[PDB]
Amino acid sequence: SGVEGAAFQSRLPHDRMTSQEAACFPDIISGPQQTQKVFLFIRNRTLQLWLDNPKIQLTFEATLQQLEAPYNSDTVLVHRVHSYLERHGLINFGIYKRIKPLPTKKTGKVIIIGSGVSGLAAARQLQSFGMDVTLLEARDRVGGRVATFRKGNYVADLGAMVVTGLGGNPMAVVSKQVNMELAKIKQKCPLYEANGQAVPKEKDEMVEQEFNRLLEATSYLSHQLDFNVLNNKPVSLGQALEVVIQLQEKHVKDEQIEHWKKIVKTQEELKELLNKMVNLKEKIKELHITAEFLVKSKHRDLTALCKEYDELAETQGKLEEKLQELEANPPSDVYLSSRDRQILDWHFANLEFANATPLSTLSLKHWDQDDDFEFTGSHLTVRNGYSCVPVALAEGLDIKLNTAVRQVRYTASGCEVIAVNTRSTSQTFIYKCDAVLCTLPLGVLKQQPPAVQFVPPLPEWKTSAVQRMGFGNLNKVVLCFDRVFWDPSVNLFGHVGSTTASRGELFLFWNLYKAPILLALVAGEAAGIMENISDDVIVGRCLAILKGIFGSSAVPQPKETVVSRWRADPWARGSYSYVAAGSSGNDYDLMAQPITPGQPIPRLFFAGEHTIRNYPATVHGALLSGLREAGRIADQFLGAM
Ligand SMILES: Cc1cc2c(cc1C)N(C[C@H](O)[C@H](O)[C@H](O)COP(=O)(O)OP(=O)(O)OC[C@H]1O[C@@H](n3cnc4c(N)ncnc43)[C@H](O)[C@@H]1O)c1[nH]c(=O)[nH]c(=O)c1N2C=O
Numbered sequence: 001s002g003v004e005g006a007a008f009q010s011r012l013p014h015d016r017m018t019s020q021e022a023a024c025f026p027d028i029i030s031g032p033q034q035t036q037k038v039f040l041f042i043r044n045r046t047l048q049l050w051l052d053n054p055k056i057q058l059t060f061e062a063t064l065q066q067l068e069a070p071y072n073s074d075t076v077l078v079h080r081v082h083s084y085l086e087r088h089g090l091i092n093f094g095i096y097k098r099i100k101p102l103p104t105k106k107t108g109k110v111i112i113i114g115s116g117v118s119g120l121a122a123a124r125q126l127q128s129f130g131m132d133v134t135l136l137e138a139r140d141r142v143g144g145r146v147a148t149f150r151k152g153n154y155v156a157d158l159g160a161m162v163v164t165g166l167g168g169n170p171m172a173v174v175s176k177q178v179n180m181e182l183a184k185i186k187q188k189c190p191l192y193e194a195n196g197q198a199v200p201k202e203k204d205e206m207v208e209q210e211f212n213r214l215l216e217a218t219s220y221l222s223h224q225l226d227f228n229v230l231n232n233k234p235v236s237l238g239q240a241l242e243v244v245i246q247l248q249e250k251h252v253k254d255e256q257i258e259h260w261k262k263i264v265k266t267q268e269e270l271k272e273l274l275n276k277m278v279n280l281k282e283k284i285k286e287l288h289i290t291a292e293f294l295v296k297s298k299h300r301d302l303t304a305l306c307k308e309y310d311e312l313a314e315t316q317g318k319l320e321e322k323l324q325e326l327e328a329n330p331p332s333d334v335y336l337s338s339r340d341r342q343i344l345d346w347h348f349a350n351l352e353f354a355n356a357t358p359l360s361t362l363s364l365k366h367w368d369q370d371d372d373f374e375f376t377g378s379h380l381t382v383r384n385g386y387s388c389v390p391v392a393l394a395e396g397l398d399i400k401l402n403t404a405v406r407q408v409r410y411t412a413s414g415c416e417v418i419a420v421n422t423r424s425t426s427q428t429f430i431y432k433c434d435a436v437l438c439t440l441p442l443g444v445l446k447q448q449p450p451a452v453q454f455v456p457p458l459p460e461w462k463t464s465a466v467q468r469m470g471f472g473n474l475n476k477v478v479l480c481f482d483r484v485f486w487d488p489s490v491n492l493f494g495h496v497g498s499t500t501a502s503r504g505e506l507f508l509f510w511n512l513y514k515a516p517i518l519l520a521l522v523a524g525e526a527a528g529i530m531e532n533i534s535d536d537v538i539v540g541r542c543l544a545i546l547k548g549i550f551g552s553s554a555v556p557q558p559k560e561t562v563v564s565r566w567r568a569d570p571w572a573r574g575s576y577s578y579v580a581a582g583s584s585g586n587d588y589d590l591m592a593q594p595i596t597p598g599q600p601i602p603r604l605f606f607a608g609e610h611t612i613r614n615y616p617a618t619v620h621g622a623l624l625s626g627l628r629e630a631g632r633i634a635d636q637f638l639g640a641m
């Protein structure tokens with residue numbers, strides 16, 4: 001269905017009210033069931049109208065005109081649903097043509113720190129709600145962790161680059177709006193060992209299968225057996241993995257031992273049967289009244305011994321057969337060979353890439369707490385660089401670039417934000433406002449020697465959440481060539497590293513369809529460490545790997561190279577949050593919580609990828625967090641109309 005799909009596209013249940021809807025419509029949820037289904041149909045249809053054409057504003061008027069004929073008479077209820085959906089950024093979000101323009105007089109002043117996707121999304125909302133909005137951005141560009149390299153015909157994304165499925169993803173709407181073409185990522189990812197040799201199909205699938213079983217087993221240990229605490233310390237995913245690996249190695253040693261015992265037993269039995277057979281032979285030997293009765297007597301005596309000997313020879317045959325059968329079918333000598341382990345490490349590296357951190361830092365219990373909210377559909381890349389999104393969202397907004405915020409003061413009567421110019425650190429600005437929306441990356445909030453001061457320091461419940469949460473790292477080397485020397489039918493191929501410690505080093509190479517660019521990813525422990533290597537040396541290390549795979553003559557010098565260093569970047573201090581051991585999804589809720597000065601009204605608000613528990617560490621999460629806070633701020637200052 002269309003209306004059912006609209007709800008789904010909006011991350012809502014089509015056939016029931018959410019608790020947030022319950023709060024805003026207490027009369028509906030406590031009323032007759034018939035009216036609840038009217039509510040849901042109006043909601044689902046209003047969403048559909050928006051999603052069918054998100055390039056224009058969906059007004060209350062137009063919703064009412066397009067509703068069919070009992071519902072177009074629910075005038076008041078339709079207005080209430082429209083208002084709710086609009087306020088919460090489920091319709092009329094992103095970039096679209098306004099039908100009713102903004103009042104020239106603006107109500108309330110909001111300073112937004114950061115113009116990444118969350119700041120930009122929030123700003124458009126607050127602006128379209130008729131508030132006065134200024135964004136202060138430290139960089140000489142918008143977009144933050146959406147960072148596109150553009151030079152000549154080369155386009156490459158240094159930050160976010162993947163749209164993780166369209167089904168339920170608000171980036172589907174934003175992409176439609178900016179005419180951003182999306183292409184599917186082909187799944188085939190052949191692996192090459194450190195020497196350049198392809199990993200054959202059979203091996204690849206065996207090791208991948210083991211990877212999945214190992215992960216499944218940690219999930220079992222955590223959520224079925226509750227193995228989440230050791231030595232009064234929360235257990236990490238990495239820690240649990242090594243425990244599961246040790247158990248597998250033990251199992252292999254056990255079955256090996258049992259086999260050796262069966263062999264030794266059978267060897268013993270043979271030896272002992274040989275002995276008595278040797279002695280029976282010696283008894284046959286030393287067996288060498290009428291003459292004729294003596295002849296008969298020796299005959300029956302001797303054939304009694306030969307019948308005895310045949311019985312034993314039969315058992316000799318059965319034992320030698322059993323022995324040969326055991327020596328032919330031993331079980332595995334090892335759980336994983338050195339080579340097998342290295343390949344398994346590639347899969348671990350890949351997981352460290354997705355989570356932006358070594359596995360030993362991830363919470364066993366909570367690392368994947370957000371899996372339940374993953375979107376449906378194939379994962380996609382952007383045709384002409386992801387920066388099209390924040391650039392488009394910036395249109396019409398008041399953005400102060402090269403303006404690094406240093407102090408935030410907030411009181412029961414208002415707020416002040418002090419910033420400095422980053423080209424001339426002498427000149428300092430003071431910005432007055434009724435509300436501050438903080439979109440500083442978690443890494444910036446963690447910074448020791450702090451980058452930004454809060455007068456009233458942030459309360460302990462906030463700072464302890466900041467401290468508990470992980471902020472990861474992940475980097476890329478962009479290699480721009482004259483020609484495609486790799487297979488154009490693969491988007492991805494893997495480099496199996498030499499050690500466990502260095503498994504994340506240039507472990508994955510990425511290409512977009514028919515562009516002469518390779519992206520080499522640096523993940524896990526290698527990510528932070530490799531930042532201390534100059535571009536030339538790291539590019540050199542890339543070329544060496546590529547030469548080992550494609551041939552030392554098939555690989556030309558790159559025309560252009562770029563290398564991200566997200567941890568060293570002072571405006572990021574890493575790539576994105578991860579659920580650290582000792583933290584949980586709750587810390588994301590805590591990060592989202594506004595601060596009241598000390599009934600004083602809330603003054604300091606928080607958005608960004610680290611403040612949304614269901615969608616952290618993503619562009620859509622950043623976007624949704626922005627819509628959320630805009631909603632809450634407008635409710636505070638313009639009333640929950
Ligand atoms: C290498 C890499 C890869 C991926 C992703 C990320 C990365 C890095 N991420 C995360 C998102 O980029 C991020 O969550 C979001 O952009 C944050 O979006 P966000 O939560 O809005 O954070 P931001 O850092 O973009 O915005 C904060 C802004 O604040 C500015 N700022 C900082 N200090 C300031 C100050 N003192 N004063 C004023 N402004 C200041 C800073 O320059 C920046 O513009 C992905 N996202 C996604 O969906 N698909 C992906 O492929 C990926 N990707 C990998 O997997």
Ligand SMILES: [Mg+2]
Pocket residue numbers: 213214217248
């Ligand atoms: Mg197993």
Ligand SMILES: [Mg+2]
Pocket residue numbers: 499501502
């Ligand atoms: Mg090493």
